[PDB]
Amino acid sequence: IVEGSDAEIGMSPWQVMLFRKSPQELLCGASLISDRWVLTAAHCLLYPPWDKNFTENDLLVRIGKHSRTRYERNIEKISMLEKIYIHPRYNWRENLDRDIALMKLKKPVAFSDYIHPVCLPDRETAASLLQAGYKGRVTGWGNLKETGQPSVLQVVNLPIVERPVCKDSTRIRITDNMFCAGYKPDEGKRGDACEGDSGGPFVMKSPFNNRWYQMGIVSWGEGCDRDGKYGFYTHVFRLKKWIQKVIDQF
């Protein structure tokens, strides 16, 4: 995260770290949506241009964390993966359309002060809150600048951007399964996700029921925190039917 700040303890208890077993390293963020399901970006698991195609046994998820590098004894919980599910129409060839994956854990995780699931949006919450100018929150352990790494989880609040501005910022084909967020050059304030943050959550706190909802998944950007560029997020609500089908079947 660029131009963010240190998270408070327990500020994002749904935040998950995707961790490679060997070599041991951070791969991506992710989020806890129930005691046995974790949501991330499909490109964190499958990206053939980079020879990336992880299997369950290659990976662990670490839940309840604050420090990036420490083993947080008696606080974090480490879970093995039972099964990975990637959206069948994830478009890794062109633009990361439908950049979403689910990971089922081998055993349920126990909730705690540090471990608690985020809500997924219903149609009405999405329609009400996914409006230009409305801010969400992005969290992660990724790099602090494009060209460096944080001691603890970072957090930044960013406004959703008007769809024409998102489209006019890039040559990539933008789809209805994406939204973009970030400040404009004239707004002064700054901030963005960066390498290592992808797959983590873009959340909003509903003013109707005072619950946190995951509206986006950190998906892609061109650089980090560049003027006139914006970060792109998977539109979680638009893909809810697939999420539900997976959880119902499996």
């Binding site: 700040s5 408070e8 303890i9 327990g10 500020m11 208890p13 949506i33 129930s34 705690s112 002060d113 540090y114 608690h116 699931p117 985020v118 809500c119 997924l120 809150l129 100018g133 409305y134 801010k135 969400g136 929150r137 957090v155 609040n157 406004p159 909003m204 706190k205 509903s206 003013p207 005072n210 619950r211 946190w212 909802y213």
Partner: peptide, 28 residues
């Protein structure tokens, strides 16, 4: 799911984090 999105160290105690008000103020 019934308890989703309510943080033990914040909403469940009626404590606010340092920047959530920035989000609320944007929901015009």
């Amino acid at each position: 799911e019934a308890d989703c999105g309510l943080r033990p160290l914040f909403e469940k105690k009626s404590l606010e984090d340092k920047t959530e008000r920035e989000l609320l103020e944007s929901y015009i």
